[model samples]
Target: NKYKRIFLVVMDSVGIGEAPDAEQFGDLGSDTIGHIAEHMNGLQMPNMVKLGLGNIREMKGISKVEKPLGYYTKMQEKSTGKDTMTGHWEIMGLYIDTPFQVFPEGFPKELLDELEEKTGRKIIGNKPASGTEILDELGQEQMETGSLIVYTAADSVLQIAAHEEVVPLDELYKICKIARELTLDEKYMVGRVIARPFVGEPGNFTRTPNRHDYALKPFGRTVMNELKDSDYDVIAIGKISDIYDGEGVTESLRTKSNMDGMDKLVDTLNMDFTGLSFLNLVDFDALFGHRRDPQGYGEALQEYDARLPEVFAKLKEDDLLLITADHGNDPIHPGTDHTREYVPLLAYSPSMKEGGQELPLRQTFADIGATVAENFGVKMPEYGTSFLNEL
Candidate 1:
């Protein structure tokens, strides 16, 4: 029988511990899982422990499980970067030994001036700022002047904020698309051109779900593309479709929140499919991680744990489930930025002789990409080594 379905869920910034390369990225001693648990007086992820997630962290200051339940592997990142795009690409078999574009001090004036000239509107707040806070600070001014709000964060992104009702969604999206086209190559290569559309008055303004992410093209081809090329369905729920810039996606769905993303995941599972279904639940990283709210992050984890039974019930007998993270954003850190840390990997299947058995430590995140390629019976990408064959 065909192992017809594969589900890959990326728990964005749900890092387990610091990788050996953490020092290179200035993120030594960062641990998302450990810190979150420590803040909560220790995490209570019994379900994740049953899936062998807790065991992988035992080698470090992170939490450990006396008896793990599934295949647990902790892999160090080997990329030249630590952002979401870099981590996702590396997992999809792209080895970015060279770092991508980063705006540490913030985007230069030349680029901002060009964007203003092109959009025919003056820009405000071109420095690094949090998404919600920036809107709160400048949203009213933008609405009053009909100007565009441009900002950046620690990640490699060019964010454009505008009041949705004030500046029309189509127009805002059009400007964002143009920005995405212009910012390319080495000089101003942003990972994503985010359309931060908001509504309401100045002080009470709020961002809406109409936001869109125009991400850079993947460095190399991934397993999702192979699956689609081989006539298999590839569904991207949440930011999965955006992160890859729709390169390998077949069907796409946008999410408003983490709960909404999970709801969509279950909805996708209910649909008849024959290939891979990719999901990205991002609230943990964006809402709590960047905000440095460890208590909030811990609460979010518990919320997901409560909702996991819905996911488990939707799995087929022949289906494989893999849950992992992209990178870490240490909530304990002072800055609201992405942290350089190692992600966790957990594989679960009812078909196994044992329900959840511990597997070996995967050297790189590429094993995940390789596994997807192997499961879909297609050519695997260059970077990662797959553990599917070993299983």
Candidate 2:
């Protein structure tokens, strides 16, 4: 491998600007960073600024650095959908034209009946709804009757929320596992079966960190798989393992927040892994972007940026660091859905001869997988041009 170790970090839902097809996805004017910076009087991410984040696009607060610390570019999605699964899969060099099936009208009766029979609990609210609102509407009822509140949304997700006090975590997870196992049919297949646990009383219910996602195994082998089969270490932090359903991962760590994910990454950096350490920090999307809280998102961005130095200080000469995002969840958007937008790509290494180089806009996110595969001398993906030499 040209670089003995590669660190790929996905700052979930941190888009630089709106994509040309944003309007086609009903997100015409959505710009995650731009809107957040404007709303909060500018984002306070000094480390990101040093990496040429400002150079990627014009923003209200962030400015272009005279000397960027890495080569930067933005990549568009060739995949049909903009959810976490599709974006991450595309990054791993898998092209997905047919979007996962969604149930905007709610799942069929047979599906709900199957879930109820297996879980031995009554199922209610099988419709498109927000998590908190659904909890607010049914939290008391669920607690009173020990029933499951099953729901779906714009994404191909089947969610089950239960009060932690009413049902144990093991049972909640068992229910989710059963649901995941049952939905293998093409018509009923979904992207994820998520066990969403909550605590507290009726109106004050709060979701817990015990949340677990059961994702369908990746349909195709990923770049990580190629690396692993060749005896390379592949580690996953945060929800990266859940996103891939543990495919192609040798070691996986679960995380409660972005800061926690960063902490795990730093520790991994200190270790002597000879391959890839992949991470996904989801606070930007789950905590702030979906909540439509620009200020919160900016604050989280600043918090994460502060952790960059912890990473930089531990880098080895042979370590290659790449930072990018999956999709956009503009906090100021009218609806709470993923926006079609280009994700930033920043490549850096301690031994690099060049920095501040602007690579051409990448047509697909798979370029990242291609670059990694090429660097490690593994099987290349069908899509994407490798930019390994550009660095």
Candidate 3:
């Protein structure tokens, strides 16, 4: 294999611009990175600038360098949904034609009744609402009556918010497990069942770090499975294991924050590995983007950018590093939700001949999986065109 190890990082919602079919998803003017850059009066990402992030698209802050140090392009999602699971799954070569189910009016009464009966707790706030808002609105009631705060979103998710002091993490997880099972049926099939545990006083409630997601298993095999079958290492960091339901991962490393994920990635580069190390930095989406704090998001990007040289310093000659995103979450968007946008693809290797070359706009996220498979001499996935030769 030309590239012995592949390091792929998903900068959770760092989208570059809107996709062609953005209007269909109700995200016409959404641009995660562009909007954040403009909102913050220009971002400072010299490391990414050298890696050709500016070459992928024109932005308010990120300027295109004359001679970039990597191969850069953008990729569009072929999958039908814009959630974390859908984007990550598509990156691994699983195109979801049928989208997952979402509850705008909330879960059905029959479903809530069954959940209440099974969990022995009354359910409240079954409508689509923000996690923090729902917690603030119903947290006191839940503490007083021992009820559950259940909510949904535009995405295919069923989130249950509970105070950690009132309800133990284990119990919340168990209830989510039950919800995961119930949603497996077609009538209530959701992509993820999330346990959102919070703490502190009623007025100043803050979500805890013990959140857990119960995701549905992948519908088909991915490049991770193919690599594992070939006796190659497949390491998953952060919530990557949870997103794929631990399907194709050989080892999983849990992370506490975006910085924690980056620390893990730096440490992984020091270890002996032959296949792939997949990482997801979630704070960009969870802390800043979802909260609609563009300043915070820009600062987080700069923090990550400051650590880029450390990663680049540890890369071996045959090591290939890919920086990308799952989807877009524009902080300046109308509602606090993910946007339909193109994800930047920045590929770099010490052995590459070209310094600044623009790869074509990829048609599907599966192209990444295909390129990984090609690099490792493994079986190529059913979809996506490999850009190994171009690289």
Candidate 4:
């Protein structure tokens, strides 16, 4: 093996620029990193900048460096959908040909009736809305009447929100499981059935860390699966295991926040493990991007960048660190949905030359899987050419 261990950390929804086919996805001029940097007047990502991130695209604050510390490039997603699953799956070598089904006009009565029947609770707020917004709108009524707030978003999901005091986490999760099964049919299929449990009273409602998602299993095997089959440890951090439905995950760790995710990653690095330690820090997408707070997103980005050197310091000579993102959630974008954009890709190892190489812009996220597979001397993915030798 070229490397004894590899760490693939996904800074979830941190797209650099609009993809070439952004127009087709109706996400023209949407740049997650660009606008965040512009809004913040400049972001201080000395660590990422040293990785040649600025060379991927021009942005405010961070300028391209003549000599970088790692291999850097941007990769467009080949999958049809932009949800978490599609992006991560493609990164692990699966092509999502058919997008997950979604419900914009609200779910049909048949589905809702079954959900209500299975859960033995009346449902309310059957519409596509933001989690916080929907919480404010129906939180009081749902709390009072003990009804569930059912909602959807641009992604293929059926979300059920309920007060922890009223419905309880156990009850809410059961309802979500029922919804997951109900939506498995081809006609009403959804990507995930999320149990959004919140606490506190109406106006002060706050979502709990107890949020659970019943995500559909990957349509095909991923690089994680191959790595696991080959007796390599596939440690999943944050929502990485959930996104893949725990498939091929040897060990999984759940994290409450991005900092917590980093803490776990650092701890994982300290352990004696081989193969892949896959992590997804989702605060960029969840706390800042989906909330459409560019300044907050920039702050989070800088905070995350601050944590990179700790990882850099922990690196062994044979340890390969891959830094990339699942997709983009441009805070300045028109809607709350994900933007069609190119995710940054940075590959680094202590043994690499002093000056980093600017690798070619990859056409698919699967290039990551290809690189990982090649590094482990495993089966190559159908999609993606391994840039393993480029390092």
Candidate 5:
């Protein structure tokens, strides 16, 4: 049967295993899924159990079921880096061999100097650190001196933080805009320029909802553009729109939180749109994962699991639903950085007679792009092969 539509939801930081390049990234011990299960006193994801997800791991807690609920397994990324942009781009058929820019120690002197010169304001922190904690520690000084808070994270991002009241939202955004324009070139190549706007008094500060991401344009053509060129409808939810820099998005929606993201996803499920619906529920990575909250992470996963039945009910007979993650940030890990780990892949449809089956181990995340390309009869890129044929 021909698939009428496809929905791909990325639960950010829901990593499944350590990538082959883990050692190079200093994330050799990261395992988002395995560690989470262990933390939960044995993760009981009955919804995904029927998909042979437990069997994918050889661990004590995870075991294969005789009659699975759906098709499930783990996938490793082939990109040179494990950041969000790299993982998502690979899933859309663009391979990154050299990895995007990283500010290990901090943003280079040249970049910081240029930014200060352009903004006419001194920069605060340029080191890799947590957005909330950094702002808390230095927010008062920033407000008093009117300096911009510049920071980095495990991913390839240049973040600008400012208290909304002290620095007008528009002005703060303009600062980020200039930063975005300056980093577009290859030498200063960064994945995202984030506007980390906050509100309230110092020591009582809070991040606002005005967070914005300016991502680098896709290095190579992706399936989204191909589908768009073919006149197919492409729906983007959450940061999917931002990560692609709106390259091929036909319809876009911003999410307030993880739950809001899911609500928007369900709204699409109720619509009659065709082509692809790409969604990103980011709180797992943003709110819980990076903060190293294991209990919060487990609860988030369970919440999504509880909502699975609604998705199952909403799917059309020929519609496909693909659930996966871009990267991992093991909440139990010591650092507040993106981890190098495998991501689980689960694909389901009402059309499958065998409700639960074990899909073969997908070699790389690009197989996802290949499958989507194949479903629409579009050309597949060379980065990864498609597993749609197996399905």
Candidate 6:
């Protein structure tokens, strides 16, 4: 097999530019990478620049390389929403015509009453707000009364934040599970139920690493299912396994941070896997983008760039590496939510004869799934046009 092992890394929330339909999603002028670079006066990512990051779109600080070292392009999302589940599902050959439900005005009274009765705890803060800030505003009350800090966002998610000391991790997870089940009905078709656990005093509370996500199961088969059904080893790292609800994954690994994810990827490279090794580095979005910290996001990118050489050095002759993002979480955007934008796609291989070439703009994110299917000799998905031969 020319491409026996494929390493797909999703630089979470690292979009290149605004999508053509960004205005429809209230994300006009939202450019994740461009705004980040411009806010910092320029970005210093030599490794990505070499891989044609600047060539995909006009960025403020990143200069386009004369001869890039990989194939580059931008992919537009065909899905209806810019949430993480929608973006990742689209990447795996699943198109969502109807977006998952979001509770901008907070969840309905019936849902809250049901949850309170089931968990034996009162609910507070049933509004869309930043997770950390919500914790700060309600954490003390929650600690005093054991009330669940239930909240939502622009995305189709139901997040429940509780103090670890007050409510045990297992109990928190169980509440989220109940919420996940309740949302299965069409009246509350949320995409994910997240357990946001925190510790310490109310003013100095910090979210722990034990945070878990319960995502809706895929409506249909995806690329991961196709590969796994064909007896290929599908490895998921970080929240990739959680996003898919553990479907189509043979093995899964968890990580604490972006650098931890990179370390885990480096460790996995030493193992013998003949199929897809998918990883998601999420700190860019969770820690910085949601907090509106462009400088921190830029710094995180630089840190990942520094670790690229080690990742590239582990590649074998038949190995292929694909770097992309699920969606854009522009730090400078008005609110702390995912932005509608074009995700960058960069493909490189150690065995390729060519160095630099600009691939045509991909119409949908599913093109990646189609390319993966073609490489592994599996059935191509119906949604995407494969660009495997172009490489």
Please list the C-alpha lDDT of all candidates, in the order they appear: 0.81, 0.89, 0.90, 0.89, 0.83, 0.89
- Candidate 1 deviant stretches above 4 angstroms: 59-67, 97-105, 116-121, 129-147, 162-175, 196-212, 355-357
What does candidate 2's lDDT look like per residue over 128-194, in tens digits? 8888998999989999999999999866789999999899999999999999998876678789998
TM-score of 3: 0.88
Alpha-carbon runs more than 4 Å astray in model 4: 101-122, 128-147, 153-156, 161-175, 185-189, 196-212
For every candidate in turn, the CA RMSD to the true structure comes to 3.2, 3.3, 3.2, 3.1, 2.9, 3.0
Off by over 4 Å in 2: 101-122, 127-147, 153-155, 161-178, 181-189, 195-213
Listed per model in order, the count of residue pairs whose N, CA or C atoms clash below 3 Å is 3, 0, 0, 0, 9, 0
TM-score of each: 0.87, 0.87, 0.88, 0.88, 0.88, 0.88
Clashes of 3: 0
For residues 107-223, what per-residue lDDT tens digits would candidate 4 score against the true structure?
899999988788778989999988789999899999889999999976678999998888878878878888889998867888899889998886888989898879889989888
Model 6, position 132, has a per-residue lDDT of 81
Could you give candidate 3's per-residue lDDT for residues 1-391 as a string of tens digits?
9899999999998998899999999999999999888987889998999898888876777889888888999999999888888899889878987667778788999889989989999999999988678878899998888899999986678999998988999999999999988888778879899999999888899998898888888878999999999998999999899889998799999999988999999888988988999999999998888788999999999999999999988888899999999999999998767888999999998777568599989999999999999999988999888888888
The residue pairs found clashing in candidate 5 are 16-342, 17-341, 17-342, 50-68, 50-69, 50-70, 51-69, 51-70, 70-356
Scanning candidate 6 in windows of ten residues, the lowest lDDT window is 348-357
What is the Å distance of residue 72 in model 5 from its true position? 3.0
Q: Give the alpha carbon lDDT tens digit for every residue of 68-136 in model 5.
A: 655777888888777788888888988887567767688888888999999999998888878678888
In model 3, which runs have C-alpha deviations exceeding 4 angstroms?
Answer: 101-105, 108-110, 113-121, 127-147, 152-156, 161-175, 185-187, 195-213
